Amino acid sequence: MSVLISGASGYIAKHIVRVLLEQNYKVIGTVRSQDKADKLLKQYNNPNLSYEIVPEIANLDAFDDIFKKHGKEIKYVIHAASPVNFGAKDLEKDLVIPAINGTKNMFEAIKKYAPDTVERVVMTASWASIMTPHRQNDPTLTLDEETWNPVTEENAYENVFTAYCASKTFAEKEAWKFVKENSDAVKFKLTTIHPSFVFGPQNFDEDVTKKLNETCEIINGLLHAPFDTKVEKTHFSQFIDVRDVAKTHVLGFQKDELINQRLLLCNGAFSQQDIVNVFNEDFPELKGQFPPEDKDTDLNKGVTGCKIDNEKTKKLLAFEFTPFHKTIHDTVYQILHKEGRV
Numbered sequence: 001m002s003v004l005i006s007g008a009s010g011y012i013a014k015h016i017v018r019v020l021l022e023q024n025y026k027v028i029g030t031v032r033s034q035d036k037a038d039k040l041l042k043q044y045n046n047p048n049l050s051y052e053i054v055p056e057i058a059n060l061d062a063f064d065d066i067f068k069k070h071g072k073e074i075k076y077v078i079h080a081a082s083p084v085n086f087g088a089k090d091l092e093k094d095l096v097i098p099a100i101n102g103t104k105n106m107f108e109a110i111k112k113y114a115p116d117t118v119e120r121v122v123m124t125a126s127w128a129s130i131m132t133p134h135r136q137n138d139p140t141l142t143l144d145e146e147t148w149n150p151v152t153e154e155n156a157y158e159n160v161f162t163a164y165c166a167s168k169t170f171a172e173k174e175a176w177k178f179v180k181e182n183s184d185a186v187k188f189k190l191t192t193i194h195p196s197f198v199f200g201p202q203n204f205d206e207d208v209t210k211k212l213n214e215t216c217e218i219i220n221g222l223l224h225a226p227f228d229t230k231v232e233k234t235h236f237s238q239f240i241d242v243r244d245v246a247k248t249h250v251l252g253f254q255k256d257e258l259i260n261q262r263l264l265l266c267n268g269a270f271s272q273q274d275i276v277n278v279f280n281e282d283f284p285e286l287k288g289q290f291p292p293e294d295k296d297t298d299l300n301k302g303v304t305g306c307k308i309d310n311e312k313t314k315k316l317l318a319f320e321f322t323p324f325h326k327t328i329h330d331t332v333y334q335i336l337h338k339e340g341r342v
């Protein structure tokens, strides 16, 4: 009944591991180095947690050694390892190949060493494999769980963000293709999770560093920006709270209703300024130490970009998502409190 989770040192994954340990699962995480594993073991201080070292998911048969050692005990797999790096300079090598090869490697390791043992795979995809990046602000587009990013390999590399979104799209397509072609040989059922921009506190306060993971660095950077910084007030994207994401991944292997589902995790539109507005409203004593409030945002004019039809997802998951104001508040509070400022 052990649970394998790839890329276990990341922002989302550390919350998933917390949830797994709350529920008394035996957890095997993969991280890139023994230093990372050692630090994490001390953070959780939980005998049910172990780490195996997978230094590069893109490399040949990267997950075979794990299934050689642990094949018999791994009943569930959470495939969360994929690069989220909008500073990548080599878009093929740093984003697209690791996303795809990581996914192929995990599924082929399962097929070779535990085709009848692994019951469920929950894969972290993204809403990036559902939405169209240049239409995030297009109210004529309605997304649902059957919508696909139409990006092709030919136009994937327009910029770093389209390339990231393509890595997620192409990886997920390979996931469903594998499932299609191996229906009778491998018993696992797949569930894919599709978060939008993930905000919320780091799982451990000590992990609040000068620069955070890419998506929370949006908030962290605005929070530390000079008062005179120009902040955009036009619609940016959809968000979801990291704690909702983590909860969904664990439900993903537990609930039969989630078999063969793509789950679209969005809970609200925002601009940069809507984030800043939370700083000023909730920490008024620090006004002037970050950019100012301005209520003239796209959101407040009823402008939210592409439409999100995730009713099926919400009905399947049943639990209520965390609202934007709380997600931002909790992110900001953790940072300011760590800094000894509130």
Ligand SMILES: NC(=O)c1ccc[n+]([C@@H]2O[C@H](COP(=O)([O-])OP(=O)(O)OC[C@H]3O[C@@H](n4cnc5c(N)ncnc54)[C@H](OP(=O)(O)O)[C@@H]3O)[C@@H](O)[C@H]2O)c1
Pocket: 006, 007, 008, 009, 010, 011, 012, 013, 031, 032, 054, 055, 056, 057, 058, 080, 081, 082, 083, 084, 098, 124, 125, 126, 127, 168, 194, 195, 196, 197, 198, 199, 213, 214, 215
């Ligand atoms: N944050 C979001 O808004 C968002 C939204 C939708 C989906 N997701 C997906 O959720 C997953 C984690 O995202 P995150 O925001 O938590 O980012 P993160 O904090 O940067 O987590 C990434 C984790 O994957 C590992 N990783 C990436 N590339 C790897 C590689 N080539 N080889 C081995 N390990 C690798 C990282 O290990 P190292 O740090 O040591 O490289 C890290 O453990 C990803 O699949 C992401 O695509 C994120």
